[PDB]
Amino acid sequence: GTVVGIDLGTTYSCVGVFKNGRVEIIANDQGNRITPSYVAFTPEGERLIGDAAKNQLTSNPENTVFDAKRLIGRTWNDPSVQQDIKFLPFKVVEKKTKPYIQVDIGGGQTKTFAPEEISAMVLTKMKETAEAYLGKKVTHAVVTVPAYFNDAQRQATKDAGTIAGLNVMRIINEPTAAAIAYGLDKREGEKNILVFDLGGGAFDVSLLTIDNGVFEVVATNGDTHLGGEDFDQRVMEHFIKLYKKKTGKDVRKDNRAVQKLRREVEKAKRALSSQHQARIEIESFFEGEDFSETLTRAKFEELNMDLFRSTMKPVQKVLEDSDLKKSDIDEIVLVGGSTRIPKIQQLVKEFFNGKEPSRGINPDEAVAYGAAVQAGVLSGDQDTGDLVLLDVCPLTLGIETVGGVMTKLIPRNTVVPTKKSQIFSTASDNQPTVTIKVYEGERPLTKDNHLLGTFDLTGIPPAPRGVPQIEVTFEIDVNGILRVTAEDKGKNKITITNDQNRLTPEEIERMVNDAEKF
């Protein structure tokens, strides 16, 4: 059928379709070309998704869910998850070592959701938006992820797609999608394009070469827990502390107070993109008292300056990894909602010695636009023109060798799909199982990198230590997701079992079925 492109964002999502020779970004039922990544359950049992969910946050905060993009593919004990919990009104509980979400779905009835199920609801809303515009069912999609997403975050996004009843044909890295929006139909030779992608929750920088519809990522780097949400938390914290100093009272555990502050902080941030001061006004803030304060642009900037400045380190790294200087950059493409912040634009400009970013790019839509073009290509639409993408893995994959040392299998910035094979053997006589832990990251020792998964090579026939010869192949697919397989080089196929913190097959089937009821 008609394959859609969905930008699944932390705070906002966007859907496009390639039709009649061009991309159309599809407006939702309220006329908005972006939709809040919010879900809510009214006290009466109505499920709200998008604008309606966000609009009732302050009256029903404990049963309004958002920020799921910063919870998927993470463990409960991740310090980033524990940071966000302080500013999230909904209950987050540990289940299967992961942050699950508990809400009241109506009439006092508790329900627990995996964060993938929240993202599935958002994807369902984006699918419905496209279906209303197209006048037909949508079964297939290209869905975006941050370039710096790890394996678990990628797989969790695909699982969200599955739970939404979508066949996710391709997971596309956000800056790659944005590069397509910039570069589609340009015949300007080969150019070095830097995409600076700072959204509601994640930060990516990618350097690409673009040449007449051929897009190649040379290097990428970022931080999947740096964006708008962090800047909002800094301002919320400022005003929580301001109230503490004024009254002596702590509002941090009052969800109504904190989320009313969130609403106002969002509006102020938007206003401060064009004004130098904004008013924070809350009628019934805490214990019958109102809240009435000013936020200057200078204060907003001061509260966030360390975070704003931290965005230049990934830019530095991508230039080094690509063997390019600042002066080799032909265009700077700014995408993501946080690139509307004047100070962010100034810092990027100053970092590039006064160079102006590319005009004609809406930072809220460019990623969706690119996703819709790639969806057009995967639908066989010739009006997209020749469109070739070469993308990379963001993180070095490795294994542990003697001394806790990170030993490389596949280095960062390798074009995918790619594979690496290695022979493994046993450490003791008659050992029936060999366990291999795979890590993601650039640090010297495995303990300072991220555990991707534990893989057990099982059914190894009895033999003396060191005699078995098992060739394990580690393959990263075009989506950026790892598959591990094994062959006895001495019955050829070796059964591998893995633990990668993924939703179980039973979970996914149950969650798919539950979603179909809505």
Numbering used by the authors: 28 to 517, 521 to 548
Please, what does the article write about this entry?
The abundant Hsp70-type chaperone BiP (or Grp78) is a central component of the chaperone repertoire of the endoplasmic reticulum – the gateway to the secretory pathway of eukaryotic cells. When the burden of unfolded proteins in the ER declines, the ER-localized enzyme FICD (or HYPE) uses ATP to transfer adenosine monophosphate (AMP) onto the hydroxyl side chain of a single residue within BiP, threonine 518 (T518). The data presented above reveal that AMPylation biases BiP’s conformational equilibrium towards an ATP bound-like, domain-docked state that is predicted to weaken substrate binding.
To facilitate crystallization we deleted the N-terminal nine unstructured residues from mature Chinese hamster BiP as well as a large part of the flexible helical lid (SBDα) at the C-terminus, a deletion that favored crystallization of the ADP-bound G. kaustophilus DnaK. Additionally, we introduced a T229A mutation that strongly inhibits the ATPase activity of BiP and favors FICD-mediated AMPylation over ATP hydrolysis. In the crystals BiP adopted a domain-docked conformation. Accordingly, the interdomain linker was well structured and bound to the NBD by parallel β-augmentation. However, the nucleotide-binding pocket in the NBD of AMPylated BiP was occupied by several water molecules and a sulfate group was found at the position where the γ-phosphate of ATP would otherwise be located. Although the crystalized AMPylated BiP was clearly ATP-free, it adopted a conformation that is characteristic of the ATP-bound state. First, the side chain of T518 is oriented outwards and protrudes into the solvent. Second, additional electron density extends from the T518 side chain hydroxyl group, consistent with the phosphodiester linkage to adenosine.
